[PDB]
């Protein structure tokens, strides 16, 4: 039965790890973990992994 990171990536935007018996989210370089500890917010322009629109 899917638990923690195996259940919808633990609700993380990006990286999910399981520590103690709990989800810990984190983000790629050039992103900051949001106040909710789940979303990843780009720190500057042209963050990695985004298709360009400007």
């Amino acid at each position: 039965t899917r638990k923690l990171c195996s259940l919808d990536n633990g609700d993380c935007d990006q990286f999910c790890h399981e520590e103690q018996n709990s989800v810990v989210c984190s983000c790629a370089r050039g992103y900051t973990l949001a106040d909710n500890g789940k979303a990843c917010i780009p720190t500057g322009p042209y963050p990695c992994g985004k298709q360009t629109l400007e």
Partner: protein, 233 residues
């Protein structure tokens, strides 16, 4: 790329093109950061001297967004072997930093365990490049991309006349006439996760292109994340 679609404006911004002395593309790369390109070790034997072009989508036309960079340092994996193409990976440090803009942006490097459990277990990834559009053809003048199913590791070994090492994985179609091809070599295999694209493979080799019962063979980038990190410092 055999089959697939053109990269439209802004769609494949991490694509790089290695160009020889004649200004012709012979391999791809993936932009990792303003100074670094990921490519295949085997590509380094296809030209004596080369440069890297970014921002290009049509080699016939100048869209004003293209830029060429010279290579300062070539870091080739010391275990690369021509016989099997094992360890088919190199990193290039550029003399000058890439200017990110429309059609020029890095792909994200994922963490190893999450990539293996979560990215490589997705249904598909996306390969792109300026390679041949059929097995016996000329290089594309248009940047193309193609969604490729991840292929079961057992099926892949069974399909192959050559050894599939743990530094390799298989993607594509059993019979559908879509694959990467020669000249896509060295280029990006990325996997989308929630609208963010992570680099997952390097186009490496195949038995022809788009052949029935055969798949595209990619360098498994997760096997080299530490090595890549070291190489970039």
């Amino acid at each position: 790329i055999v089959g697939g679609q053109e990269c439209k404006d802004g769609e494949c911004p991490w694509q790089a093109l290695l160009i020889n002395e004649e200004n012709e593309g012979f391999c791809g790369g993936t932009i990792l950061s303003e100074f670094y390109i990921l490519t295949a070790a085997h590509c380094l034997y296809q030209a004596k001297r080369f440069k890297v072009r970014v921002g290009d989508r049509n080699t016939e036309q100048e869209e004003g967004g293209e830029a060429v960079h010279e290579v300062e340092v070539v870091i080739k994996h010391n275990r690369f072997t021509k016989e099997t193409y094992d360890f088919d990976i190199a990193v290039l440090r550029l003399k000058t930093p890439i200017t990110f803009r429309m059609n020029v942006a890095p792909a994200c490097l994922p963490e190893r365990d999450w990539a293996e459990s979560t990215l490589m277990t997705q249904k598909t990834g996306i390969v792109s490049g300026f390679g041949r559009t059929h097995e016996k053809g000329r290089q594309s003048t248009r940047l193309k991309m193609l969604e490729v199913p991840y292929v079961d590791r057992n099926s892949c070994k069974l399909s192959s006349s050559f050894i599939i090492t743990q530094n390799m994985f298989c993607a594509g179609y059993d019979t559908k006439q879509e694959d990467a091809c020669q000249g896509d070599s060295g280029g990006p295999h990325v996997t989308r996760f929630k609208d963010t694209y992570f680099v997952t493979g390097i186009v490496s080799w195949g038995e022809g292109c788009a052949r029935k019962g055969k798949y595209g063979i990619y360098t498994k980038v997760t096997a080299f994340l530490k090595w890549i990190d070291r190489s970039m410092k």
